[PDB]
Amino acid sequence: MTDRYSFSLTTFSPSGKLGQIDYALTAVKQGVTSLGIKATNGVVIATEKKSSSPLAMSETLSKVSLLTPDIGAVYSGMGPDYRVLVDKSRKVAHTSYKRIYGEYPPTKLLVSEVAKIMQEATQSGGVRPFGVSLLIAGHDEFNGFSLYQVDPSGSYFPWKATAIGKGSVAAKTFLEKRWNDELELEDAIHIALLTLKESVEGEFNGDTIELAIIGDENPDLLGYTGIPTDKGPRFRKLTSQEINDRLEAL
Amino acid sequence: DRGVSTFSPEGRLFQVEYSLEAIKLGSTAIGIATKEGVVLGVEKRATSPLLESDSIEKIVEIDRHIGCAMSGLTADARSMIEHARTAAVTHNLYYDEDINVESLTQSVCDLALRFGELMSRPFGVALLIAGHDADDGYQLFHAEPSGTFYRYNAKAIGSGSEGAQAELLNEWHSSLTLKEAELLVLKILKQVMEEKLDENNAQLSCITKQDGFKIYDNEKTAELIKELKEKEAAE
Amino acid sequence: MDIILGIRVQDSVILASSKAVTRGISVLKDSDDKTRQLSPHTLMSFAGEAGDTVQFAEYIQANIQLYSIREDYELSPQAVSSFVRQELAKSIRSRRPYQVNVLIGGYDKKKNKPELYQIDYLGTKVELPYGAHGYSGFYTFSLLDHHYRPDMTTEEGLDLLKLCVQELEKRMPMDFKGVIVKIVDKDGIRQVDDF
Amino acid sequence: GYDRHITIFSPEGRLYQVEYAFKATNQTNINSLAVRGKDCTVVISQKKVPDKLLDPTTVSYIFCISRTIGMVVNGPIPDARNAALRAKAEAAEFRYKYGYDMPCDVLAKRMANLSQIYTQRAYMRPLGVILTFVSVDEELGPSIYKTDPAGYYVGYKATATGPKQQEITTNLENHFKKSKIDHINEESWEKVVEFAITHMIDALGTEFSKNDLEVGVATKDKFFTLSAENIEERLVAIAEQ
Amino acid sequence: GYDRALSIFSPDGHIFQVEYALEAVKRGTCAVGVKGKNCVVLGCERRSTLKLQDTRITPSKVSKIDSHVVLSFSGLNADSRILIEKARVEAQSHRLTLEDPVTVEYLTRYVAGVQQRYTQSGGVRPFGVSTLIAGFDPRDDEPKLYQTEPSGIYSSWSAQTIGRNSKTVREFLEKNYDRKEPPATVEECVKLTVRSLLEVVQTGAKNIEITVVKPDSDIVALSSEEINQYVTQIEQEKQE
Amino acid sequence: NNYDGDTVTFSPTGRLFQVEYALEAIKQGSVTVGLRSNTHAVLVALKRNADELSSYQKKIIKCDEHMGLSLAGLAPDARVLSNYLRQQCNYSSLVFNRKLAVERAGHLLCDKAQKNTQSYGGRPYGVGLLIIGYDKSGAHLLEFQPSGNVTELYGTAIGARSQGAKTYLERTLDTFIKIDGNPDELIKAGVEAISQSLRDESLTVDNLSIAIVGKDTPFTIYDGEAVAKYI
Amino acid sequence: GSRRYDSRTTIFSPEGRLYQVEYALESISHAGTAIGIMASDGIVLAAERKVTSTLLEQDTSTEKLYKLNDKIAVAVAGLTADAEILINTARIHAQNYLKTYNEDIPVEILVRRLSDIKQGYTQHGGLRPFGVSFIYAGYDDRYGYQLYTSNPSGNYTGWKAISVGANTSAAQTLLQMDYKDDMKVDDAIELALKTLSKTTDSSALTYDRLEFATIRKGANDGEVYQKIFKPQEIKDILVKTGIT
Amino acid sequence: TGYDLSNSVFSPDGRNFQVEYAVKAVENGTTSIGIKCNDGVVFAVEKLITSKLLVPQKNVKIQVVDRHIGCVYSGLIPDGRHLVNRGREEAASFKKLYKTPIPIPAFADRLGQYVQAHTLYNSVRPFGVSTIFGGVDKNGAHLYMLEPSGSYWGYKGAATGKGRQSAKAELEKLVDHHPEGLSAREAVKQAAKIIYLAHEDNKEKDFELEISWCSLSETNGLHKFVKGDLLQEAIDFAQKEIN
Amino acid sequence: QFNPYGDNGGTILGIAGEDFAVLAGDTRNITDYSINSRYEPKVFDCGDNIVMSANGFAADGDALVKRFKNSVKWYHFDHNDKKLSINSAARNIQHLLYGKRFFPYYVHTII
Ligand SMILES: [Cl-]
């Protein structure tokens, strides 16, 4: 018995390709489109809620996840792989940072820790790479707002705006025309909804779209009062109603 | 590929059988047992004339009463000798006595099959273990990588083994003197060796109850070589 | 083990270490050298628990010599002293700590300056103009406070050292059988045979 | 093609072992169904006992995981029981560690994460089973959550699993289009079971005796399975209307 | 832990991994060892496809194991560092327990034992390295020169070469080296070593490294100009 | 063919080829015979040599004062298994002050051989054993096969040409079973049994190997001039 | 068992080469080119970013040039994720040395240890090697300014000027042509950029597709300063040498 | 293909071919049966007499677990012994912790999970035995049958081995003709008959009969072997029915 | 606190002649002021013409004799039924005793 697979399942081919990483990226290509846009006073991340069945409750399945109060994440590719990455990402934020420094990690460093986990699945024994690409939006005091992409290889890149998955090629082109360095958060949400309508085919409403923002602090969502320095989470998930309001003036 | 500890359809371990082929490529080693002592001789076989032949160590002491000759992948024998020397000294420590030649051989042969997926492969070297004890007297053993050992009155291992063994079959009798056995090893070595036998490319040794295990000098062997040539020309 | 002294002067470091080895009511030896050369320009004297002292000294010596071969380069006295301190700092929280106190006298060839470090068994390091371990310090420190000057020569340092040994021989309870003196300077390490 | 033997990616970004585990799901040739009432969650499954020598009471694919959670499995019984034992242990440990009964959806996620590990780690094979968890959660009310060999899971208004799953699914879809609500508007669990059996009869097109069915019911603070006579009583009520 | 038996026997009785490790040695730059009457000289080739090199900081081919023993090699450079490190550690460990520096034979035996261990241990491949180990035993003036190889066998040599085109330079040494009368002086020994490398090298500029080891820890490396003088002298005598 | 790479693989017809190949190693081995009466149990073994200059490979091993075996196949594997039996017999004596039953001895060997046939990396044992003994329920003879299968018998034989001796014992069953209180006659029957497996060679003084255990007889082995009586 | 699926990453070819190391080098040859040039009064590190997108955040980005300590930096060529694993190890190793000896780690010692880690992955463990080649640029008080390179084999060598990644053959010829020993930093800056400008696979070399860094003694009196160039600073140095 | 070369690998059908190959080894083995009765169970097995040299009554195949459970199996005999050794460890640790002897359904799952575990990895081989087992506990009598895949069910009657179909047919008749129930002493007689009838499928070598039983009334809820007069009475009953 | 040692009393005596040797010992076994047995032998024939007694704490004494008797048995198995000489037995017993140097057998052994 015991795990006898102590050797790498991802290796270099004669051409220099790492096959399993390439094939993981192919799985991401098949995945549903998700995107992220950075504004001057915030960041928006969005994706389509592809329902497996109309009997299924799509509210129970959350594609956009809170990692820290000021950091959020969305993906394209294999959902189960994403779910466990979110669990590990939330934990590593505590174990390797918050329990040491008494504060949440900045976006770039949390991204770095997630990238490390994904890199190890590329080299460690008896495992395949994760079949997902992440988009991680976040805010911190000294770096401000930021948006990162993380690939199956463990590589990460900062973006002004980008898209991943099914219709990423067209969606990136759309964002190049609309993006400027003077965009306000509401303008970025508007552009996000426009970009996403192109890739979505069926119903386009608050129930089939999942969208969250990294913006101003939310004291009402904090849950308590009495500490002035604690002002609330910058991460907020837009409700089904809030999305539909913006779809009328579209 | 395939498992290291795999049986063939004939009922033999592939790796053990392949290690035996490596031993056939090795240099010749011959042992002869008499009532006056046991003689051990080896072909040095220097790969180049610049190589200082006296540094070729294919005959080796295990204890004062046990000697050892080797043939095959000789580098593999180092840990076997190390184990044998430890086993011999350890037994003396535990029991205040010399260890039996057979018990020493058994201890070495226990390492043999300790391979698989323990070490990664069998040993690629065969050993001739010669010695003396009070119970069974002068003895010669042939220790293989199969974990098997046979006692022999006389035995040859290495590239010229089957030709030398057939010669030993005819020449050996129970009343051989030590001097007769020394010459007989030189005679048979000279027959199976590629290059011409002399004191530099061949080495003799013996183990007697009185003086223990001794490797002969190149001066002593040279005289035995000269004595051998004269006796063959004398009839 | 008992008396080890160290004096840093203008151009050298001088180490003096007692020759006696005593066990019970018997002086087993009166010519013991309580020092090891760590490198050509670094010398370490030692004192403390029996066995621990030599075992520790030689362990450090081996490590520094290994470094010298690996890099083909001599570590600075400051670097060696820091390495030694860390080993003792690890040791003190071990199952069985090294009960050894050391002085490290070295000549830094890059700075062209002598250096004397005092380290106790807890891993407590200090750089000093003059140092001592054990009960010796209770006499020699006050003596050196008075007579020591920073610009002294090696000869002046030896006379200053003679003054310490004389005081110890007068007021110390135990017979420590004199001292072996060694000088560390730009030209390396040498022993004074007539002291 | 060793990329089809272990759980590593194929050139087109697929895990064939996971896909083949899905096909093992229908090896038993049994269809299951789950629906929610106001106060309850009902799950029903076909019971096929082909051999006459079998003890029919021991032939079951429904499991009582905890006092509040029930689980029905679609797949071979060895993997089914493997999953059942693990879930029971996980639900027990959860209660011990965190001081309250493990919710249905949390257990579903946990088992789904375990299933995900088998799709990524090579030495472990996926289980060839689809696990449907049912309860009346104290926070979320009547609950249906379903796990598969891919490690995917999601909540359900209602659901069906098996070879003829699609026929049952659309049958339920068409009812909820008509009723305009997320559940069966019914007071007693007895009539919710009657609904479940009635709509399975319509979808599959077969009639059922008392021994052809297997029923599990989740109410507040307990999940229980029905006996043959409890089902027979239920079948009589359907026939008399 | 990774357990796979990588070094295994083949039907014909060969361990291919060990034999393929020898091919790596054959690819490596040439290295030569010649021992005279009162000295040993280690010569080493450096390939000249690498210009813009920094020779101050680039790892030297000949490595000091202790103050009295040196080690040169042919084959995989990265592999050699592991053997050299282990040897240097064992050298200091021997001084610590035996209170005497290693003999050249002992140091060779240790390094050869390490190389052998990697030929029948699970999860590891053999060292793609053959070494020339030279020096003088403590309080001894007899020169010592040993060779090791991936299989683990080791032996003593009056003169020996390893690496690429080593069979050519071995041919040269076999007729030019007299056992009855070895190079009597340092100059004679260095010249014979340089001559032997000039059969293979190309140019005698910054391609040849020479290291001379003499008794009582007297080791020095020759500079470019010093080596170039031997190259200039040999070529003028050649034109005859 | 494709299903004989290791012991962990079943063939399409449900066979374990590595176990069968291990069984083949026994057939190549030199013949050995086992038989018993109600009072004594006897092992007879034909020893094999490399050549005339070599010794004859010892086939019989003592496990306790009341138990031992003969081997056929890989001798080092017999050494491992006999050593295990020695330890188990010994554990029974030290802990329970109880002589190990010959039946339990068999059960222990069966379970030790089995584990090597169900796990990756390992290999089956390549040797067959005939265990004799005298315990609280009288004389016993067991046959061990490296598949794990252990069988209690009145008489049997394993190795090359073992079918000849096995047929003889099947005919002689009624005779030799009643040889009670007579060691030399029970051996004679065993020596005559092994003689039915001989071809071109005959039983010589340094070729034959006999062992016996019984009611008032500890397990003892006879070699050399001590077996000249039975030729 | 699992033997069936083992690639055997740490074995020799019949020619005596390490398959996986050779294939890792092939991978690295497609990575963006990185150049190191050592002058008498400093060192230059120049690297080309891999096909940039206009919506990439350029100022808050790090892909090629990483800081190991105050005196040592590295230029990366290959898998970035692999490089970061090794960089964190190197950063820790430098701090271990400082903690032990109270002195900044000599450049070669850091390089050797990082190279020894790479070597390990080629000889044992059954894992794939790191698909990374480094250019180490650093200073210490023994050898002064130093350039090294290491590759997946774990072999390292010292250089006056060197290139890694794509088009090294062409890049090394150009460096060999115009390099001389009495060169200054400002001249080396110009050489580094000119070489990339000619070897690049892009249409034209721009500020947004480059990472640049210097290690001078240009601080105040006998101390070393590391300058990781900002986007605007690269834009200015590109105009100042007349490339744009 | 190659899907059948490694254990724990799903074929495109969703099948584990290695387990199905282990079933072939079971089908090759001798016939064994189990009969559930009024207040207990009865086990029986076919022992092929390969030779006259086999000692009668002294190669026992049926195995006891704890003091109340009987186990019999067909296929690779060593694999069956390994499974029983585990069963005994499982039963011991249950009784150690919970005091009461292990219930039969509880015991059945312990074996089931263990056998199922040997279908999860390629580093182990599936079990080459189908095991018929059962006994008496607080809830009464239980009979089970466990297969290489780890699959088990409760049974009124159970059979496996080379003559399983002949035995199954004969078992089905008993279930039909005795709806109210079969007694313990009757089940022993019936067990003998069914083994003799199932021996028609293995009739080259003649055989030896071996029976055991657990009954609340007859054996006081403990597992015992049927021997002597009661065994010979059952043999005679079987001999009379074949003729 | 639990004390793992005890004193079982008794005394033993060994004398050697020219061609013979005797090993005597009383048969009384005690704890404190109570008699446990009037006949409990503590002199044992261990085979190979070696007699042994380990007097003091009887539990340690019995354990030692038991282990030496076993050592003789395995000496035969491992060395072709060779007779264990009295000098070899003595050295073997030293290792048995010193093996528990830091938790000793509380006995005086005579062979
Ligand atoms: Cl989890």
- Quote the number of domains for chain D: 1
Report the CATH number that the domain containing residue D77 is assigned in CATH: 3.60.20.10
Range of the domain at F25: 1-231
* Cβ–Cβ < 8 Å for D82, D55: no
CA pair distance A111, D151, nearest whole angstrom: 24
* Cβ–Cβ < 8 Å for A196, A209: yes
CB atoms within 10 A of CB I101: 7
Of the candidates A8, A124, A176, the beta carbon closest to that of G55 is on A176
Name chain G's partners: 3 or more CB pairs within 8 A: A, B, C, D, E, F, H
Task: Supply the Cα-derived Rg of chain E in whole angstroms.
Answer: 18
CA pair distance F176, C144, nearest whole angstrom: 106
> What are the distances in angstroms from CA A13 to CA A17, A29, G207?
5, 22, 34
| Backbone phi and psi for residue F48, each to the nearest 5 degrees, phi listed first | -120, 145
CA pair distance A143, A134, nearest whole angstrom: 20
Q: Could you write out the DSSP letters of every residue in C131-190?
A: EEEGGGHHHHHHHHHHH--TT--HHHHHHHHHHHHHHHHHH-SS----EEEEEEETTEEE
The residue to which tokens 């092929």 are assigned: H48
Chain G residue numbers touching A5 (CB-CB < 8 A):
2, 5
Report the CATH number that the domain containing residue F23 is assigned in CATH: 3.60.20.10
Chain F residue numbers touching G6 (CB-CB < 8 A):
none
The residue to which tokens 């699959």 are assigned: H151
Closest residue in chain A to residue G86, using alpha carbons only: A116
User: Quick one: CA dihedral B137, B142, B145, B147, positive or negative?
Assistant: negative
3-state secondary structure chain A: CCCCCCCECCCECCCCCEHHHHHHHHHHHHCCCEEEEECCCCEEEEEECCCCCCCEECCCCCCCEEEECCEEEEEEECHHHHHHHHHHHHHHHHHHHHHHHCCCCCHHHHHHHHHHHHHHHHHCECECCCCEEEEEEEEECCCEEEEEEECCCCCEEEECEEEECCCHHHHHHHHHHHCCCCCCHHHHHHHHHHHHHHHCCCCCCCCCEEEEEECCCCHHHCCCCCCCCCCCCCEEECCHHHHHHHHHCC
Put simply, whether G1 touches F (Cβ < 8 Å) is yes
User: Quick one: CA dihedral D132, D136, D138, D143, positive or negative?
Assistant: positive
> What are the distances in angstroms from CA C185 to CA C16, C102, C103, C118?
15, 19, 16, 18
Of the candidates D4, D81, D126, the beta carbon closest to that of H113 is on D81
> What are the distances in angstroms from CA D144 to CA D31, D40, D109, D135, E104?
16, 11, 12, 7, 77
* Cβ–Cβ < 8 Å for H212, H63: no
Q: Which helix (H) or strand (E) holds B155?
A: strand B154-157
**Solved by what technique?**
X-ray
Query: Across the beta sheet with B29-33, what order do the strands follow?
Result: B154-157, B29-33, B38-43, B202-208, B212-215
- The answer to whether chain C touches chain D by having 3 or more C-beta pairs less than 8 angstroms apart is no
Q: Which tokens sit at H171?
A: 């078992």
* Cβ–Cβ < 8 Å for D131, D71: yes
> What are the distances in angstroms from CA C135 to CA A239, C16, C54, C167?
79, 14, 20, 13
Q: Where are the domains of chain H?
A: 1-243
* Cβ–Cβ < 8 Å for C132, C6: yes
For D217, residues 6+ apart whose C-beta sits below 8 A from its C-beta are: D40, D41, D42, D43, D70, D189, D193, D223, D224, D225, D226
For chain C, the maximum distance between any two Cα atoms, rounded to a whole number of angstroms, is: 48
Range of the domain at D140: 1-241
Q: Which residues pair with I25 in a beta bridge?
A: I12
Name chain E's partners: 3 or more CB pairs within 8 A: A, B, C, G
CB contact under 8 A, I77 and F90: no
3-state secondary structure H123-159: CECCCCEEEEEEEEECCEEEEEEECCCCCEEEECEEE
Angle CA(G198)–CA(G200)–CA(G202) in degrees, nearest 5?
120
Which member of H1, H30, H119, H160 is catalytic?
A: H30
Q: Which tokens sit at F185?
A: 């006659």
Of the candidates H9, H120, H168, the beta carbon closest to that of D124 is on H120
CB contact under 8 A, B120 and E159: no
For B191, residues 6+ apart whose C-beta sits below 8 A from its C-beta are: B160, B163, B164, B167
For chain E, the maximum distance between any two Cα atoms, rounded to a whole number of angstroms, is: 65
Chain B residue numbers touching G3 (CB-CB < 8 A):
1-3
Angle CA(E120)–CA(E124)–CA(E125) in degrees, nearest 5?
85
Q: Which tokens sit at G71?
A: 């005196």
Chain G residue numbers touching F120 (CB-CB < 8 A):
1-2
The residue to which tokens 């599959």 are assigned: D204
Q: Which residues pair with C117 in a beta bridge?
A: C104, C127
Side-chain-side CA neighbours of H205 within 13 Å: the count stands at 11
- Quote the number of domains for chain A: 1
Dist. CA I110 → ligand 1 center (Å): 65
Q: Which tokens sit at F201?
A: 């060679």
Report the CATH number that the domain containing residue B161 is assigned in CATH: 3.60.20.10
* Cβ–Cβ < 8 Å for G234, G201: no
* Cβ–Cβ < 8 Å for B133, B98: yes
Chain E residue numbers touching G108 (CB-CB < 8 A):
57
Going by the DSSP 8-state scheme, the letter that residue G3 receives in this structure is G
Q: Which residues pair with E157 in a beta bridge?
A: B51
CB contact under 8 A, B169 and F51: yes
The residue to which tokens 């602090």 are assigned: A217
CA pair distance A163, A156, nearest whole angstrom: 14
Q: Could you write out the DSSP letters of every residue in F120-181?
A: SS-----EEEEEEEEETTEEEEEEE-TTS-EEEBSEEEESTTHHHHHHHHHHHHHHHTT--S
- Quote the number of domains for chain F: 1
Q: Which tokens sit at D234?
A: 């239920």
Chain G residue numbers touching B3 (CB-CB < 8 A):
3
CA H182 to chain centre: 19
For F112, residues 6+ apart whose C-beta sits below 8 A from its C-beta are: F81, F84
CA pair distance A72, A235, nearest whole angstrom: 6
CA pair distance H99, H96, nearest whole angstrom: 6
Report the candidate in A207, A216, A247 with the shortest Cα–Cα distance to residue A56.
Answer: A207
Q: Which helix (H) or strand (E) holds B157?
A: strand B154-157
For B169, residues 6+ apart whose C-beta sits below 8 A from its C-beta are: F51, F52, F53
CATH fold, domain H1-243, is Glutamine Phosphoribosylpyrophosphate, subunit 1, domain 1 (3.60.20)
Dist. CA A71 → ligand 1 center (Å): 21
* Cβ–Cβ < 8 Å for F84, F125: no
Chain H residue numbers touching F10 (CB-CB < 8 A):
18, 21-22, 24-25, 125-126, 128
> What are the distances in angstroms from CA E6 to CA A6, D123, E13?
14, 21, 15
CA pair distance C136, C125, nearest whole angstrom: 18
Q: Which residues of G touch D (CB under 8 A)?
A: 2, 4-5
Q: What's the N-to-C CA distance of chain H in angstroms?
A: 51
Of the candidates F12, F119, F154, the beta carbon closest to that of H55 is on F154
Q: What's the N-to-C CA distance of chain A in angstroms?
A: 60
CB contact under 8 A, A153 and G79: yes
Report the candidate in H76, H109, H79, H60 with the shortest Cα–Cα distance to residue H224.
Answer: H60
CA pair distance F39, A242, nearest whole angstrom: 98
Query: Three-state SS for G9?
Result: coil
CB atoms within 10 A of CB B81: 17
Put simply, whether H178 touches D (Cβ < 8 Å) is no
The residue to which tokens 């270099």 are assigned: A12
Put simply, whether G2 touches H (Cβ < 8 Å) is yes
Of the candidates F8, F117, F156, the beta carbon closest to that of H123 is on F8
* Cβ–Cβ < 8 Å for D46, A59: no
CA pair distance G30, B188, nearest whole angstrom: 64
Report the candidate in H200, B138, D5, A222 with the shortest Cα–Cα distance to residue G1.
Answer: D5
Closest residue in chain D to residue G2, using alpha carbons only: D123
G124 Rama sector, left if φ>0, alpha if ψ -120 to 50, beta otherwise:
beta
* Cβ–Cβ < 8 Å for A35, A192: yes
Which segments within chain D are labelled E, that is strand?
32-36, 41-46, 62-64, 70-74, 130-137, 141-147, 153-156, 158-161, 213-219, 222-225
* Cβ–Cβ < 8 Å for C121, C88: yes
Report the CATH number that the domain containing residue G154 is assigned in CATH: 3.60.20.10
For E182, residues 6+ apart whose C-beta sits below 8 A from its C-beta are: E35, E36, E37, E158, E189
The residue to which tokens 């049926």 are assigned: H62
- Quote the number of domains for chain B: 1
> What are the distances in angstroms from CA G138 to CA G87, G187, H51?
14, 18, 85
Range of the domain at B117: 1-235
Put simply, whether G85 touches C (Cβ < 8 Å) is no
Q: What's the N-to-C CA distance of chain F in angstroms?
A: 46
Report the candidate in C69, A100, C123 with the shortest Cα–Cα distance to residue G100.
Answer: C123
Closest residue in chain A to residue D125, using alpha carbons only: A3
Report the candidate in D214, D211, D189 with the shortest Cα–Cα distance to residue D31.
Answer: D214
> What are the distances in angstroms from CA I69 to CA F133, G76, H118, I51, I53?
22, 70, 44, 10, 12
Query: Three-state SS for F203?
Result: coil
Task: Supply the Cα-derived Rg of chain I in whole angstroms.
Answer: 15
CA pair distance G76, G59, nearest whole angstrom: 18
For B18, residues 6+ apart whose C-beta sits below 8 A from its C-beta are: E9, E10, E11, E12, E13
Report the candidate in E191, E220, E185 with the shortest Cα–Cα distance to residue E38.
Answer: E185
Put simply, whether H124 touches A (Cβ < 8 Å) is yes
Q: Which tokens sit at B146?
A: 């199969």
Dist. CA D120 → ligand 1 center (Å): 14
Report the CATH number that the domain containing residue A79 is assigned in CATH: 3.60.20.10
Q: Which tokens sit at E230?
A: 């031997």
Range of the domain at G17: 1-244
The yes-or-no answer on residue H160 being catalytic is no
Map out the domains of chain E with their CATH numbers. Answer: 1-240 (3.60.20.10)
CA C132 to chain centre: 8
| Backbone phi and psi for residue D136, each to the nearest 5 degrees, phi listed first | -115, 90
